[PDB]
Design a protein around this ligand. Sequence first.
Ligand code: HEM
Ligand SMILES: *[C@@H]1O[C@H](CO)[C@@H](O[C@@H]2O[C@H](CO)[C@@H](O)[C@H](O)[C@H]2NC(C)=O)[C@H](O)[C@H]1NC(C)=O
Ligand SMILES: *[C@H]1O[C@H](CO)[C@@H](O)[C@H](O)[C@@H]1O
Ligand SMILES: [Ca+2]
Ligand SMILES: [Ca+2]
Ligand SMILES: [Mn+2]
Length: 357
Amino acid sequence: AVCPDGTRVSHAACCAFIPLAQDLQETIFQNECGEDAHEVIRLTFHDAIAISRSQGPKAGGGADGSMLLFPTVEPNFSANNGIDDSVNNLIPFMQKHNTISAADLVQFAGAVALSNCPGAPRLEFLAGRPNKTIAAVDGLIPEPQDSVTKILQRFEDAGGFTPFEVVSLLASHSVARADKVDQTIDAAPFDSTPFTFDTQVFLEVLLKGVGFPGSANNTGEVASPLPLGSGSDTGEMRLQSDFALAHDPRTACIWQGFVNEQAFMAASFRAAMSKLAVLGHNRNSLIDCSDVVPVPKPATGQPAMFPASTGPQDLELSCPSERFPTLTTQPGASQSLIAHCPDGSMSCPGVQFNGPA
Ligand code: HEM
Ligand SMILES: *[C@@H]1O[C@H](CO)[C@@H](O[C@@H]2O[C@H](CO)[C@@H](O)[C@H](O)[C@H]2NC(C)=O)[C@H](O)[C@H]1NC(C)=O
Ligand SMILES: *[C@H]1O[C@H](CO)[C@@H](O)[C@H](O)[C@@H]1O
Ligand SMILES: [Ca+2]
Ligand SMILES: [Ca+2]
Ligand SMILES: [Mn+2]
């Protein structure tokens, strides 16, 4: 097909996604792997994972747009605290780009956001999910205080995911920060490169924790190896769940195996997101519009490194059968701040629409 803009595409049904990508990039992402991109990637997961094989379809329809179509229901569950921002940012696109379902908009917006993060893969994108569903029930979203047994079970019940696929999906914590876990600080990053889809989070969760970026008493949080912050440049936060996954025998070797293995991490993430993005649907009934996902920013290709103030003596290793890689350490004895903004500054407020969630 040839779309009104002159673009040649796979199928005519894919055409409408071209001006939607352009509008998302101009209006809320600005081609950056920034705050609003991060919040939309988190929403792709919270929309898709609310589905249960054991409870049946009444519990939820998966990647179905339920967060946008029932904005006063799931976004107010305690485990979804903070998801209101992404929902209120995407509802105006649903109203305007009104030949694309809420469910397709959520998954496609996630693919466009991740393409702004250097090193990310170009996700598969299948289209055609219906625009009608139900609100999901509470209790289906994993939380940072949960055990590994509880987390792996939730992912098995949602879509048959293996432990390898679960840790693969957690490469998204390479481009992720926390606003609600600690009520005294905003935008606490999970690795020292929250604007780059690299393997640093896998390395940095394996370092010994030495302090906290904010208070020492929040549910779901454990000590961080890089807790220093100043002004808006908040220090690194460590979730109990990532820590527990990095040390549990079921997942410790998979966690370590992504350290300094960028192409392996990105291809494994692509494969598991291919499964997550179609929860609630038969993939044989969705059309392939992968050709309209933007081409992702490339990485520089540099190896993973220990950040200044850390080194191999700080590692807490848990995988007996695989050799930890040889990595260099950045010079300096004291911690470097983790910038609040992609261009290195401290000041870069993102667009936020008000809305019903
Ligand atoms: C056991 C699994 C998981 C748990 C318990 C978990 C937990 C969390 C927590 C507590 C936050 C901080 C939210 C806040 O306070 O603002 C967060 C942020 C984030 N999560 Fe996860 N998550 C998990 C899986 C996933 C997966 C599978 C993805 C996507 C493929 C994902 C993508 C993100 C993103 C991108 C953010 C950053 C949001 C931002 O910076 O604005 N998470 N996660
Ligand atoms: C999917 O459902 C949503 C919600 O019902 C539809 O959104 C409405 O869209 C029209 C324009 O087409 C707006 O005037 C309304 O205000 C929107 N409703 C709400 C509650 O926001 C959307 O049009 C549907 N999309 C498709 C592809 O059928
Ligand atoms: C980042 O900043 C720290 C000091 O905060 C240095 O030690 C490091 O070398 C880098 O310049
Ligand atoms: Ca959903
Ligand atoms: Ca990173
Ligand atoms: Mn956020």
